[PDB]
Design a protein around this ligand. Structure first.
Ligand SMILES: *[C@@H]1O[C@H](CO)[C@@H](O[C@@H]2O[C@H](CO)[C@@H](O[C@@H]3O[C@H](CO)[C@@H](O)[C@H](O)[C@@H]3O)[C@H](O)[C@H]2NC(C)=O)[C@H](O)[C@H]1NC(C)=O
Ligand SMILES: *[C@@H]1O[C@H](CO)[C@@H](O[C@@H]2O[C@H](CO)[C@@H](O[C@@H]3O[C@H](CO)[C@@H](O)[C@H](O)[C@@H]3O)[C@H](O)[C@H]2NC(C)=O)[C@H](O)[C@H]1NC(C)=O
Lengths: 41, 32
């Protein structure tokens, strides 16, 4: 505010937008590798 | 397509009630 408990309206997700084009295309020109950990009983 | 509350609230004598969801229909509509 010093901290306190506050109430808020939750966000649904990041605010993002991409323009539509019938003429152009976007493609990757690089890549990466990553590892995800998953656990199940 | 028991006690509850819309929006006014009301209760029954039977001790029963239904809780609201975290995500309302409009929030879902936004996701879809
Ligand atoms: C995709 O992006 C990654 C990084 O996000 C690129 O990997 C990086 O490539 C450079 C070579 O150009 C690697 O070596 C660097 O060279 C500079 C030269 O002065 C030096 O200053 C840096 O300290 C480093 O040595 C850099 O280490 C490397 N990054 C990693 C994490 O290995 C990758 O090449 C891109 N791929 C393509 C196809 O462009
Ligand atoms: C929780 O209980 C309180 C207390 O009864 C409710 O507050 C009351 O809300 C109404 C509507 O906002 C306020 O205005 C009233 O409107 C009716 C319409 O016909 C009118 O006849 C009344 O004379 C009055 O204008 C009313 O003043 C207000 N009471 C107080 C003390 O502020 C509250 O709305 C209830 N909560 C819910 C979710 O209903």
């Amino acid at each position: 505010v010093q901290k306190s408990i506050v109430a808020y309206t939750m966000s649904l997700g990041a605010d993002s937008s991409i323009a539509y084009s019938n003429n152009t295309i976007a493609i990757p020109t690089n890549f990466s590798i990553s590892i995800t950990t998953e656990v199940m009983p | 397509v028991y006690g509850e509350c819309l929006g006014i609230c009301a209760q029954k004598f039977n001790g029963l009630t239904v809780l609201p969801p975290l995500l309302t229909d409009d929030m879902i509509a936004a996701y879809t």
